[PDB]
Amino acid sequence: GGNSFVGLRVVAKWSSNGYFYSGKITRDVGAGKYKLLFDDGYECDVLGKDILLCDPIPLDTEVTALSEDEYFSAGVVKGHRKESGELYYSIEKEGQRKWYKRMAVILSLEQGNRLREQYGL
Ligand SMILES: CN1CCN(c2ccnc(C(=O)N3CCC[C@H](C(=O)Nc4cccc(-c5ccc(C(N)=O)cc5)c4)C3)c2)CC1
Numbered sequence: 001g002g003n004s005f006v007g008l009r010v011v012a013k014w015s016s017n018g019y020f021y022s023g024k025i026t027r028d029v030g031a032g033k034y035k036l037l038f039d040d041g042y043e044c045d046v047l048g049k050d051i052l053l054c055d056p057i058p059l060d061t062e063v064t065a066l067s068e069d070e071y072f073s074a075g076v077v078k079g080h081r082k083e084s085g086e087l088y089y090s091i092e093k094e095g096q097r098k099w100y101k102r103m104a105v106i107l108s109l110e111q112g113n114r115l116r117e118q119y120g121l
Pocket of ligand 1: 039
């Protein structure tokens with residue numbers, strides 16, 4: 001129903017760059033679209049096909065992990081932990097794991113497109 005997805009966490013495409021970002025559905029607005037509040041505080045309407053109802057991003061998913069500066073790279077989700085309700089992902093790269101905060105994990109277009117079958121609205 002209309003309220004079923006309100007407050008659910010998603011990973012959804014930002015049209016401008018093809019990447020899928022963490023956020024929550026805030027409203028079913030019709031015409032196949034939902035109002036999203038992204039974790040960066042942007043609120044806008046996104047097509048269901050561009051929303052992965054996927055939280056946490058599961059084990060063995062290839063993601064883009066963001067570091068300090070201009071450093072980002074592909075890695076594989078190998079773990080999850082909470083620290084005061086904020087989520088961290090354990091990302092494996094070249095046999096070495098590091099913890100990343102939720103907003104330091106995004107999906108390239110290709111990485112998000114892989115999950116549409118299983119998680120897309
Ligand atoms: C939902 N929002 C809407 C606004 N969005 C953009 C607007 C304009 N321009 C860009 C962009 O493509 N550029 C080029 C590249 C360098 C910059 C940039 O996006 N830098 C940046 C660096 C580190 C982390 C993030 C980040 C991580 C997570 C989230 C999240 N989960 O919400 C949002 C942003 C962004 C800017 C992105 C980001 C997504």
